Design a binder for this molecule. Sequence first.
Ligand SMILES: COc1ncc(-c2nc(C(=O)NC(=N)N)c(N)nc2N2CCCCCC2)c(OC)n1
Length: 245
Amino acid sequence: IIGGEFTTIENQPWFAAIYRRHRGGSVTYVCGGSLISPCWVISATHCFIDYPKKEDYIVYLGRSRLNSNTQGEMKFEVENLILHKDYSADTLAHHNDIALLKIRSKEGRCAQPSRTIQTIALPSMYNDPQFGTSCEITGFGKEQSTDYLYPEQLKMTVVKLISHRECQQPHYYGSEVTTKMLCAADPQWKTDSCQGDSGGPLVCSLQGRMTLTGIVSWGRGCALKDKPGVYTRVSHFLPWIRSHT
Ligand SMILES: COc1ncc(-c2nc(C(=O)NC(=N)N)c(N)nc2N2CCCCCC2)c(OC)n1
C-alpha cells in the first residue's frame, strides 16, 4: 500500500495473509486474501500460477504483522487450491484473476470467528457501488514502488471507484480493462495498491454493509498518474464462487 495508514487486523478482520514454503525451509509472503466463510479464503490466481501446488502454502488469519506472530492468530494448511480455468495474462492485465483456498488446520478445523477473525460479505449479483464511491484496500504490499522490503505492519488506504468508461480511455488502460474488472484510484494518485497487495480485498459499503467488491489484481506501476489500480470485479464471479465452495 502506497500512502494510506498503518492498521491492525481488527479493522480488516477478514484479511488473510498467504505465505509459501521454500524447498529448503524458508517461508516468504505471497499475497493477501479475504475470508468469505470459515473454510474459504478468496484471492488472485496470479499469486499461485507459478507454484500451483497446495502443499507449499500457509494461510494466516488474525495476523497484523508480516514476520511476527499476532496474539489470537490462526494458521492453516491449504486443503484445496482452486484457480480460475479461464485465467490468462497479458503484459499487464490478468484476466479472471480469482482463486479460492479451502483452509484447514493441522488439527482439521476451519476458522473460528473472533475479534480478529471475521468473514466479509459477498456482493449481490452485478451490484457494485457508483463511481466515486470510497472503498478501502488492505495489505502488506510495498510502501513505495522502488522499495525492496515489504512493511512489517499491515496497511490500509482509501481509493475511489472509477467508471468503466474512464478506465478504458487510451491514456489509462484502453481495452486492457474488461467488464469483469474494476478500476480504483486516488484523485491525486497519491495512494494505491502495489506489489504484494495482490489478492487482497477492495471493500465498499453496499446495502449498508461492508462488502467484498474487488480483489487486488494489477496495474502499471503504483500510484502513477493515469494508471489506476485494477481489481477483479467480484460481483461478476458469483456463480463461479458459489459453485466452487
Ligand atoms: C512499473 O512497475 C510495476 N508494475 C506493476 C507492479 C504491481 N502493481 C500492482 C498494483 O496493484 N498496481 C496498482 N495498483 N497500480 C500489483 N498488484 N502487483 C504488481 N506486481 C509487480 C510484478 C508483476 C505483477 C505482480 C506484482 C509494480 O509493483 C512494484 N511495479
